[PDB]
Design the sequence.
């Protein structure tokens, strides 16, 4: 019985109860996805490629129906023609919003990439602002909760859509649970039932037994190289929601008069189907992994957020080293414990629009994939490193144990 | 020699000189494309796939540079993410136009699919109109020429872009040659040099030694399942033009902030490169075929448009039988002389937004591809059938001779 | 707390200790495969396709080196040019064996497919017998152990190779553990160290911490649509062993004078790499699944083999219903609880060379894949059904719970 | 007109009549292939992938039937599993031959790669010799014709198969026309009608209106990265012949008991069908190019073989410069006028089993493909360079004119 092994025996026993809970959620979600395959009568011919126009591609259409069934929506859009999560989100915004309309984000300022999209960052690019669509965001209370009086003050007759970002992303606040989201929807719908509630669902898929579309969200969007891709999707994004709303997204994604009826699937179907099927289980690996990281690092006297015993709604997990050297050594050890490009150590790197260098471990099968184990953060006080994902719980245990042995 | 063989010997001698000119154009164009590959140092690594976000895909970028080199533009956008010619065109319009801007098509009303796009066909789908962008079309003169006085009267200070459709499509007018297009461009630029000239270039690629971007067009667009795909591209579209304009198109195709810097190529690069290399030559097969069809049908007392000895700028070829039966029999024979689904008899079919039944031969490798031999037309007087494309001149001669033998 | 749920709470607590052991093995094996990726410096460019001859395909070569590293061999052969497990095995036999040589199987008669291969079933097909290569097999003792005196009697100067089939397959004997195999190797090597020991390793990969190549096997072969494909490999087989021996296999697989240096990888690399990486973990799911099936069925008074508490060396798991109806209802429920073709119920089916109908549940992503959950058996006393595989432990729990609710 | 242009005008007029005959052959062959697609009811579903074992792949089977129809054989084996022409040929030899049998090549010693296969090149690799199969070759007469008395003397009762190599390869003799091959076949069959006649058909496909299987050959084989692949097949080989013989080949390609009934097609079907459809026409480009090269070089006082006005049966074309410098400069110029890796300067290179350095131009889409334009030769007197292939006649004219301009 070694050193670190002793610590592991202890910490693993400690977290076992919560890990078991994660497995209960995974079985529930696995059944849910299986039921969705089944109600849509998925067959092996549904993996066949389409070419050219992609008209009447039943494989593509069936997959979208499977997505809609799982999220409990009327319709979905899940294609490689949606190139990412950001692209999926932008498709929702431009798809629905029209000149004179206003978008209100209530979960505080959303992730930085949306900056140019809404138009508060650049010019001439074709932002919402360029198309006469208004945008604002309501900051969170200091405690990370929604500032309801502030939201109330902001909602006007011109407010067409309310934006909710489930995951904290890089923001210093807790990710919003489905219960918290339900409360937000109830609140806005009580003010105006016609207001469209959109939730940026990235990293939350299959973390709970429920999704935002089950607590009244009208439409949601996410990334296929995160949770729902199950580690297999090579690219893409998804949209799920009301039929009228998904129709609009489709016209934005292709063109009016064609919309979602068109777009060749080529060779992407099998990986999307199989990835979705495995997604509940693979998500469970990343969650189990996060709790392990949180428990182990805390044990080694390192600050963890969230806490190993925190409620979980997404995959996000950070650890604050309060040490530049410790942070870099850890991120490098994570790369060194990765399957792909393990020998290409990350270093402090310049990043456009940022005053601080960033460090990123990304030894993955798919470029930029996040359900896979990665690590990153800005190199500045308090030296917070995001260490999350993992295709297997085994991989996370191995990598984190080695990262500890290497930096602490 | 059989009878038909005797007619062929005569007709083939008659058109030889023109077929030779087509071959001369093919060699010029083949050299143009080769020089572009060399200039851009095309390598086998340029065929490699990219996954995830598709950042720093040199293969994708190099393909784009090759397109730009051939079309003699600063920039190009060429990728699987563009699902068709219509999508390419829409991307140009929404990419460049903004609220208060006006689009003026000068080549008469453009192809029907653009109806919904501009907003004269529906409501609420996110048309140019829905986004406060103005549109109009100047009808052609009765002889099919541009109505210059009408054009002059409709150009205002708010006219941001001029639209030109090279190919006649289904319009009862001749396709516009590069020389004619040059006249148009010179004219509108004389009125306002800052006006953006866009040419829908479908079916015209490699038919002449020059493209519209060489006669003053600022930006062009087309489909990869037509000419530039060389029969090999399974899907896609292209945009080529000035860097500023192509940048704007990129933000529309993806999102602001990202643009053309993202989008996984997956496995599509090789077919696009190889198809483009083969495009000048495959285009020539389709043109030689067109001339054969025109000359043979005329010889059999059937009306052809264009005439065998007409100037050619695109692939479009029609024959008018003034007989329902002959028209149907001929189209059926074309399907029967096609490689794929030869046994699937075309019959009068309903087409959305069409009072008349249509008949179509589409026995192709790629779904809806048109550089391949196809035949189609609405079932009504004067019973005009479009018989065009052909991956090989041999295929067209065989199919057409048999179609004649089966219907006349 | 429901009926069956109560039974599950009980049985799951009971099997927990062994399941945990399976997870320890999985973590060890995950580390082992990770270490193999790392020592071979696996990078994202190693997933790139090769075409034509496939000469100097580093992606293909690196993968084979990763396989060799994991199995602790000098060399391996793992390509889609090996179309299956049977093909892999036959390649080993014809690769090494020459006229006058004799093959001796000591684990009793091997699986039926090898019948034509060795030549004890047909004629003129090019069996070992057709090529003047001898074959025999030593039956097991009644207790399922190796009959060592019988083996000793059989080994002659002409015995070039000894065959060992690790997995019981359909045979009514226990699968041979690695320790048992070590004993066999020691025994034959003591008689003649020059005798080549070959192990058919199908279904045993990653079930223990060790493989036969670690207890002295010279060469091994298996299927990529079983354990090592991790559920992702679309086809294939592998060979691993001594360099001289793998060289010979390569000449058989391609041609002499070329061998393994050639063969295009096309698009198969990523799935093979990623599948191998996930294989320890996915294998663990199928093992955990088997123990669950064994424990649950036994609880419902149904005979299980192996027992939930048996030592495990492969994925094989059966249950004997002593009831035709119960057996068929169970197999059908397994299909109905599968992701693909769930609505296509299996029925009693004729099978060539068999007196009895067979039933097979195979609602899988990959045609004929076995790491995925399936069920099959011959429809005859005692109505033994093989219920094994599972990409996730969750899937197996769900499917088995439903199969019980449906047939018992 | 420039000078070179003046020479071209003259030379092109001179060869026109022969180029026209090539086009006539192209049309005949195109019709032959089209009729085969029709006869076999080729459908778009025939392009669908198969996974796993590849059982009941109708697309794969239909492709095989199309090949058989074109070659006028009972059966064909055409698949990605055959990695080359050599592999196809080896499969035929080991598939049919058995211990005590003898193979007699009558067209002199065949291509070098077959050396190891037959067993006159190495030891222990599993050659025909290692498997107790006899081999011999009858040298050609000095004029390159068959030595009939020597052939008669070497045919015995143990002569199971007669080998005929259509193409000269690197041998200093003319390629054998179908008429010549017919003479050979008639002769050997007169000696023994039960003798199996095999023709290595590489580079000869679609060059004449007839194939060897139409002049008595029992079985033939070739490469898909040459003629029948139409420039599109990324890998592979074919075997066509009598059902009994093709059956035997199947058991060798896979295993006895299984044969041709197995092997996943994955994503290779479409390119194989489309390539075969285009093959007659692409072949014609390469032949027209060959004639252009022969006539142009001769016009410039360089020795050509074959001569511009020679009978053609395959793609092979050489030119002898009697100058190292000119030879090297010309090959370099061909690479520089190639689409892929144009910038990668060919230089004298070592070649295993060759005392002399070789130079090669291989700037192709598919690695090692030869229907595409390439150039190669050993660097030694009389400095003979093979300059052949070409996906388009335009490409050859451009490359060759530039090569002339750069070296002469
Ligand atoms: Ca001017
Ligand atoms: Ca005779």
Sequence:
């Amino acid at each position: 019985m070694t050193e670190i092994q002793t610590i592991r025996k202890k910490v693993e026993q400690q977290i076992t109860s919560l890990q078991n809970e994660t497995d209960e959620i995974a079985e529930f979600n696995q059944a849910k996805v299986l039921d969705a395959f089944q109600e849509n009568k998925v067959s092996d011919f549904h993996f066949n490629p389409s070419t050219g126009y992609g008209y009447d591609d039943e494989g593509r259409d069936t997959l979208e129906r499977v997505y809609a069934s799982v999220f409990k929506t009327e319709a979905a859009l899940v294609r490689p023609q949606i190139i990412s999560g950001t692209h999926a989100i932008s498709t929702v915004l431009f798809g629905i919003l029209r000149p004179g309309d206003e978008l209100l984000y209530i979960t505080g300022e959303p992730y930085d990439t949306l900056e140019e999209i809404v138009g508060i960052r650049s010019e001439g690019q074709g932002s919402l602002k360029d198309f006469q669509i208004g945008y604002d965001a309501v900051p969170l209370l200091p405690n990370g909760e929604i500032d309801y009086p502030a939201v109330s003050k902001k909602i006007s007759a011109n407010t067409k859509m309310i934006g909710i970002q489930r995951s904290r992303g890089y923001a210093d606040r807790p990710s919003f649970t489905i219960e918290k989201i339900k409360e937000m929807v109830t609140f806005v719908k009580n003010i105006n039932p016609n207001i469209i509630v959109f939730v940026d669902n990235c990293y939350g898929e299959f973390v709970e037994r429920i999704e935002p579309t089950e607590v009244g969200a009208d439409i949601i969007a996410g990334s296929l190289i995160k949770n729902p891709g199950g580690g297999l999707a090579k690219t893409g994004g998804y949209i799920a929601g009301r039929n009228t709303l998904v129709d609009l997204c489709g016209y934005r994604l292709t063109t009016p008069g064609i919309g979602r009826e068109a777009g060749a699937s080529l060779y992407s179907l099998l990986e999307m189907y199989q990835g979705f099927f495995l997604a509940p289980h693979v998500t469970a690996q990343a969650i189990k992994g996060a709790r392990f990281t949180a428990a182990m690092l805390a044990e080694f006297g390192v600050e963890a957020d969230p806490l190993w015993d925190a409620k979980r709604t997404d995959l996000i997990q950070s650890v604050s080293f309060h040490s530049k050297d410790k942070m870099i050594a850890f991120a490098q050890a994570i790369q060194a414990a990765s399957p792909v490009n393990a020998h290409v150590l990350p270093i402090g790197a310049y990043m456009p629009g940022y005053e601080d260098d960033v460090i990123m471990a990304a030894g993955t099968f798919i470029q930029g994939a996040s359900l896979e184990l990665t690590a990153d953060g800005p190199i500045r006080e308090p030296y917070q490193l995001y260490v999350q994902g993992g295709l297997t719980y085994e991989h996370v245990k191995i990598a984190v144990t080695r990262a500890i042995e290497n930096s602490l």
